[PDB]
Amino acid sequence: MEMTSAFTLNVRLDNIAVITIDVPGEKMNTLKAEFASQVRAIIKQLRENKELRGVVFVSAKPDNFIAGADINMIGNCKTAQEAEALARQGQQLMAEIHALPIQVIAAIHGACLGGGLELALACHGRVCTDDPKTVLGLPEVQLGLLPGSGGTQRLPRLIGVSTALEMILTGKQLRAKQALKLGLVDDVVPHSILLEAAVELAKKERPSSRPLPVRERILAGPLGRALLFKMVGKKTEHKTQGNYPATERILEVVETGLAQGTSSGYDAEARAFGELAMTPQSQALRSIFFASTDVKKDPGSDAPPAPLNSVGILGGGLMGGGIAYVTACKAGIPVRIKDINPQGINHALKYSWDQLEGKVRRRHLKASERDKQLALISGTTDYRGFAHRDLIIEAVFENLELKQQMVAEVEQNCAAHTIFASNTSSLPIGDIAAHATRPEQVIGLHFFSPVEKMPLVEIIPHAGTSAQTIATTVKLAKKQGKTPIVVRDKAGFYVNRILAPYINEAIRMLTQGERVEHIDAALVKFGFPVGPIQLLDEVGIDTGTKIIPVLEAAYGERFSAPANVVSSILNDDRKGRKNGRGFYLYGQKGRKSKKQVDPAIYPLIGTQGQGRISAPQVAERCVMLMLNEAVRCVDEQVIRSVRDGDIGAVFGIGFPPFLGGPFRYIDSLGAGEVVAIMQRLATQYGSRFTPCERLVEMGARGESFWKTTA
Amino acid sequence: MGQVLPLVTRQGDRIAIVSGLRTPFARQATAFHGIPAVDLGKMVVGELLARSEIPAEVIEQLVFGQVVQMPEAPNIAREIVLGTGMNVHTDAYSVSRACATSFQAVANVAESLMAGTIRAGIAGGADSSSVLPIGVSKKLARVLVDVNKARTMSQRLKLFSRLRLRDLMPVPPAVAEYSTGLRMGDTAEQMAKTYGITREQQDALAHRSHQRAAQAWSDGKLKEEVMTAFIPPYKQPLVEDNNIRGNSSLADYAKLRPAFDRKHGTVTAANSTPLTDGAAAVILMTESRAKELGLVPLGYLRSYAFTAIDVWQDMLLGPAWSTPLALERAGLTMSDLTLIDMHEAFAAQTLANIQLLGSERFAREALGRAHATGEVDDSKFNVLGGSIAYGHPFAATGARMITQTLHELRRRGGGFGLVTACAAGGLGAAMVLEAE
């Protein structure tokens, strides 16, 4: 009854009926087959007792209106027929709701995502609250799956293709004001009078006057549709490289709907949804989605956390400003910087100020908001005011004895229950702790500069680390809009550990007379954003070599880099953007073309002979390097869970999402076939391609990776 | 005595209150037009001294303050002392606490007087919304400072080279909060929406306030509190408040456009107080000093309290927070409180305030107190009307309430009056008066 029929009807004293939406499962209002069945009964009952003013829909929950269509049931489909049937029934149900002659109003508060807009686009009038929490948007293309239920072709009709197309292709979030200006929502009200305002909007009868569009959308059908579609297709092909499905299908289905009627659009969307949910990319993206949701819901440690209200940062510069901006502007925690030099404090403050002023120049934040946010950051050069900081993040040069000095003095001049986090990337955590009064409260919080860009962080405990410390650190990293990962304390950690062979083989191939365009295109074609050499240019060549000497010292010659290349650039300092005088020169004429490549860099490196092989060879060799390193590290329980490692690899390095991550990649490629590939690569190239023992074991015995994957 | 704090002096004498005075209030254009804010205070102070038997040498310090502020003469109390006929040895002093300025002035005088440093003082406030300081654009001030500091002639032309756009246009004054950008009335619209105040639930309060005020003038009960202002043109004197319109029917101003929302704006212009001009003052004096120079005290003072709340939603709930604290400090109860008062800067907000003091949940969670602070009877609430009638000079509406309340308790022959007010920035003030 009440549990099953989440669409409870209630007719008020007047001629208006209100329908609540309270799914008894959890706080998100999801869509299930049971709801699709029961809404037919509710609407049939509504057909009884005719001659009433209208109906309204309400969230009846404090946070959202409708989260979106449940994807768990979608995973239970088998062929295209089931998906087409589900899409057909959804389209029919929306059409039936749209087929009523009385006023139907959707009063939306909170999140309304996914197929919810479908229902919202089914109703004749929509009203939304002004809360910043509420938002409008269609986020299913990012899940690699078109949201076909009717709104795919209703939205372009309601609002011009100039915006609807980019809403569908790049499913994003819409403010209440943006929707009101655009014409998506008729009116905006405060939350208090939401139900009432919807009621009198329903009482007004039949607005038989469609608002006019920009009149530039009349291009669809006659001349103008072809030009716009061709241009957006070319743009998408240049952008996504054409390895992403569910992009040209959207263009085709929108064209068919607009220039062949709404029935044609319905059937085309039904068939496309049927055939497209079974593409491997779809379940790859769904798997990544599930993993991310699980790790966000993961509590990390099993102990209760500790309160955290103030945070300290030792050292300053570009990086310290990054941690400060993330901790203050995002999580809203007071932060105190302690650079010894006032210039460092000035640098950190200037970095944060530049970020927020750039945000405001867009007119996205009020000028008062800048002050209210900068109020959280305060610098100094002494130890006063540090006596009540729960967390301290250390971000100065990585000299060992220097770090023992820092930990000694933070123990001397701070609280007793406070915990010490080090932003180290080279030295062992236990060694940094070594001797200390409270070693159980020392943790490693490895970041990735630029801090505001890469959303992955690493949590590194050591031999003695109280579970409360891990819990607190994980909760902080969550509050900062990052993705915490627990990593065993081993040399090289995880991310850069597997990143090193990538750049290593890139340099090895570059030595063999290869051109910039070939290598860059080969790596970006295989779903990798920002190819290798400009990755080094971004991070800086000085950091490009990183601390790989410790990698050799720990794991032999496997990580050994070719000589006279890192040496040949450090002496003739070419740091990319750190000194500006990289091999991607700036200030070119126009500044509207690809970054120029120096001619003398090839003579600077050995550049022996002339290049060989082809792009597939490059892609396969680099990818199998990362795969072998990843299976190697997961062999010794570096990473607690297979999904944790896979999400880290896909989400911090930039592994192709449509491949689902390294573990998804090997599971798809299967078994000893890739093993034979890598022995033949080793034989034709060298001993670097020796397979991991667990790799050959799993390949020969046919074991799986994702539990019962195979 | 876990909560009560007496307001007695070190010698054991209570803080008596002696006469007060009020310039009749006017709209921002009718009279007082061009009359600055300083000389209104000069009028009221000078003719308040020239109304009782006190020699001017007894007064030892006067405190005024003004919200709308003129750049010249920042410390207007000194010009009040200097311009009028007073001993030039009085410690003139100025404060500013938005619409509760007069309350703060009285509190400062009372605490300094009970500290022992003073034996008699003047506390009040003057305000004029007709001499608005219209400043130039912010950009066209750094240019002026630079050209003042500019050394060579060729530097000045290079400096004015950047003078462009509409920087010449003056900047109108802003009533919106500095840090919120809320127009002080649109923070009442959402309050009305939240607590469900109907445009018919209000607009009856405005009617009952225009009445009991037109009736108050007609009875002439407020004759001894109001001056008869004389204006330097001296065309004709001003004797009665012109804002009051105690003749309109409640069905006449039910047909008005909403002011701020203009879509669901259950508050409008008629049920909101208009900007006015005026001044008011009160003579504070310790009981011993009043007795030894032969003067009957017009009541006393019992306790006071000031409070702040977050300015992001419903900042106008100041009286709700302040009142229980004042009551607990005076050792009293809402039940045993003959007559109360409210600022009623808007229709609603005041009604919301009564609803809140009547609600047990609010005092249960938002204050931590066991029980609600009590409900207010209509008859014992704004007996002589309220600010939806006379007007609202920002810095003057404080002392006016004290004078009126003391006189009304004088007519009723006893009781403990109570006065509350809310101010911009989420500031609320309350105080308990005792007319013997």
How many Å apart are CA A100 and CA A202, to the nearest integer? 13
Which residue do the tokens 């607990």 mark? B328
The reply to whether residue A366 touches residue B181, judged by beta carbons under 8 angstroms, is yes
DSSP string, A582-642: SSEE---STT-SPPEEPSTHHHHS---S---S-HHHHHHHHHHHHHHHHHHHHHTTSBS-H
Q: In chain B, which residues touch A (CB < 8 A)? A: 179-181, 190, 193-194, 263-264
The reply to whether residue A197 touches residue B264, judged by beta carbons under 8 angstroms, is yes
CA distance to partner chain B, nearest, from residue A193 (Å): 7
The reply to whether residue A189 touches residue B190, judged by beta carbons under 8 angstroms, is no
Shortest CA distance from B178: residue in chain A: A368
Give the best residue of B264, B266, B312, B313 to mutate against chain A (max A CB count within 10 A): B264
How many Å apart are CA A495 and CA A651, to the nearest integer? 10
Which residues of chain B lie closer than 8 angstroms to A193, CB-CB? 193, 264
| Cα A688 to the center of its chain, rounded Å | 33
The reply to whether residue A189 touches residue B179, judged by beta carbons under 8 angstroms, is no
Task: Please tell me if residue A234 touches chain B, with a CB cutoff of 8 Å.
Answer: no
Beta bridge partners, B420, equal B430
For residue A685, the surrounding DSSP H or E stretch is helix A672-685
How many Å apart are CA A312 and CA A519, to the nearest integer? 43
As given in the structure block, the two tokens for residue A152 are 């795919």
Shortest CA distance from B193: residue in chain A: A192
Which residue do the tokens 């659009």 mark? A265
Residue type, A365: L
Q: Which residues contact B401 (CB under 8 A, 6 or more apart)?
A: B341, B343, B419, B421
Which entry of A255, A269, A394, A458 is annotated as an active-site residue? A458
Rounded to 5 degrees, what are φ and ψ at B307? -150, 155
Q: How many CB pairs under 8 A join A and B?
A: 15
Which residues of chain B lie closer than 8 angstroms to A190, CB-CB? 190, 193
Contact present, B430 and B322 (Cβ < 8 Å):
yes
How many Å apart are CA A224 and CA A217, to the nearest integer? 9
Cα four-point dihedral sign A269, A270, A272, A278: positive
Inter-CA distances, B47 with A336, B238, B394, B398, Å: 57, 15, 22, 19
DSSP string, A182-193: HTSSSEEE-GGG
Shortest CA distance from A371: residue in chain B: B179
As given in the structure block, the two tokens for residue B214 are 């037109």
How many Å apart are CA A241 and CA A252, to the nearest integer? 18
Which residues of chain A lie closer than 8 angstroms to B180, CB-CB? 368
Contact present, A406 and A315 (Cβ < 8 Å):
no
The SS3 assignment for B304 reads strand
Give the best residue of A365, A368, A371 to mutate against chain B (max B CB count within 10 A): A368
How many Å apart are CA B281 and CA B20, to the nearest integer? 6
Which residues of chain A lie closer than 8 angstroms to B179, CB-CB? 368, 372
The reply to whether residue B264 touches residue A366, judged by beta carbons under 8 angstroms, is no
Task: Please tell me if residue A261 touches chain B, with a CB cutoff of 8 Å.
Answer: no
Task: Please tell me if residue A190 touches chain B, with a CB cutoff of 8 Å.
Answer: yes
Per the annotation, the verdict on B422 as an active-site residue is yes
Which residues of chain A lie closer than 8 angstroms to B263, CB-CB? 187
Beta bridge partners, A189, equal A129
Task: Please tell me if residue A189 touches chain B, with a CB cutoff of 8 Å.
Answer: yes
Contacts made by residues A225-230, CB under 8 angstroms, sequence distance 24+: A225/A255, A225/A258, A225/A259, A228/A161, A228/A165, A229/A255
Residue type, A450: P
β-sheet with A458-460: strand ranges across: A377-379, A335-337, A311-314, A391-394, A419-422, A442-446, A458-460
The reply to whether residue A190 touches residue B193, judged by beta carbons under 8 angstroms, is yes
The reply to whether residue B193 touches residue A368, judged by beta carbons under 8 angstroms, is no
Interface of A with B in 371-390 (CB under 8 A): 372
Shortest CA distance from A194: residue in chain B: B193
The reply to whether residue A366 touches residue B193, judged by beta carbons under 8 angstroms, is no
CA distance to partner chain B, nearest, from residue A368 (Å): 6
CA distance to partner chain B, nearest, from residue A207 (Å): 18
CA distance to partner chain A, nearest, from residue B263 (Å): 10
How many Å apart are CA B231 and CA B31, to the nearest integer? 8
The SS3 assignment for A688 reads helix
Considering only CB atoms, A193 lies closest to which of B179, B181, B193, namely: B193
Residues B397-410 as b or e (16 or more Cβ within 10 Å = b): bbbbbbbbbbbbbe
Indicate the DSSP class of residue B238.
Answer: B
Shortest CA distance from B191: residue in chain A: A192
How many Å apart are CA A533 and CA B83, to the nearest integer? 80
Residue type, B332: L
Indicate the DSSP class of residue A652.
Answer: I
CA distance to partner chain B, nearest, from residue A181 (Å): 17
Q: For B174, what's the count of Cα atoms within 13 Å in the CB-facing half-sphere?
A: 10
Task: Please tell me if residue A640 touches chain B, with a CB cutoff of 8 Å.
Answer: no
Beta strand residue intervals within A243-359, DSSP E = 311-314, 335-337
How many Å apart are CA A484 and CA A492, to the nearest integer? 17
Tell me whether residue B184 is exposed, middle or buried, using C-beta atoms within 10 angstroms of its C-beta: 0 to 12, 13 to 18, 19 or more: buried
Which residues of chain A lie closer than 8 angstroms to B182, CB-CB? none
The reply to whether residue B193 touches residue A197, judged by beta carbons under 8 angstroms, is no
For chain B, the distance separating the N- and C-terminal CA atoms, rounded to the nearest angstrom, is 22
Beta bridge partners, B128, equal B277
Which entry of B207, B210, B343, B392 is annotated as an active-site residue? B392
Contact present, A660 and A650 (Cβ < 8 Å):
yes
Considering only CB atoms, A368 lies closest to which of B179, B194, B264, namely: B179
Task: Please tell me if residue A192 touches chain B, with a CB cutoff of 8 Å.
Answer: yes
Tell me whether residue B387 is exposed, middle or buried, using C-beta atoms within 10 angstroms of its C-beta: 0 to 12, 13 to 18, 19 or more: buried
∠ CA B242-B246-B248 to the nearest 5 degrees?
115
Contact present, B278 and B290 (Cβ < 8 Å):
no
Considering only CB atoms, B194 lies closest to which of A187, A192, A372, namely: A192
The reply to whether residue B193 touches residue A192, judged by beta carbons under 8 angstroms, is yes
How many Å apart are CA A504 and CA A510, to the nearest integer? 10
Q: Which of A28, A640, A641, A643 is nearest to A292 (CA)?
A: A643
Q: Which of B394, B176, B183 is nearest to B276 (CA)?
A: B394
Beta strand residue intervals within A291-395, DSSP E = 311-314, 335-337, 377-379, 391-394
Q: Which of B340, B183, B377 is nearest to B272 (CA)?
A: B183
Backbone conformation region of residue B314, classed left if phi is above 0, alpha if psi is from -120 to 50, else beta: left
Inter-CA distances, A435 with A40, A142, A422, A690, Å: 70, 49, 15, 40
| Cα A608 to the center of its chain, rounded Å | 41
Considering only CB atoms, A190 lies closest to which of B179, B181, B190, namely: B190
Which residues of chain A lie closer than 8 angstroms to B194, CB-CB? 192
Torsion of CA A628, A631, A632, A635, to 10 degrees: -160
Shortest CA distance from A370: residue in chain B: B179
As given in the structure block, the two tokens for residue A253 are 């289905």
Give the best residue of A131, A188, A191, A193 to mutate against chain B (max B CB count within 10 A): A193
As given in the structure block, the two tokens for residue A361 are 């120049």
As given in the structure block, the two tokens for residue B115 are 């500290």
How many Å apart are CA B31 and CA B271, to the nearest integer? 23
Q: How was this structure determined?
A: cryo-EM
For residue A233, the surrounding DSSP H or E stretch is helix A225-240
Which residues of chain B lie closer than 8 angstroms to A192, CB-CB? 190, 193-194
For chain A, the distance separating the N- and C-terminal CA atoms, rounded to the nearest angstrom, is 41
Which residues of chain B lie closer than 8 angstroms to A189, CB-CB? 264
Resolution stated for this PDB structure, in Å = 3.5
How many Å apart are CA A621 and CA A512, to the nearest integer? 15
CA distance to partner chain A, nearest, from residue B193 (Å): 6
The reply to whether residue A368 touches residue B264, judged by beta carbons under 8 angstroms, is no
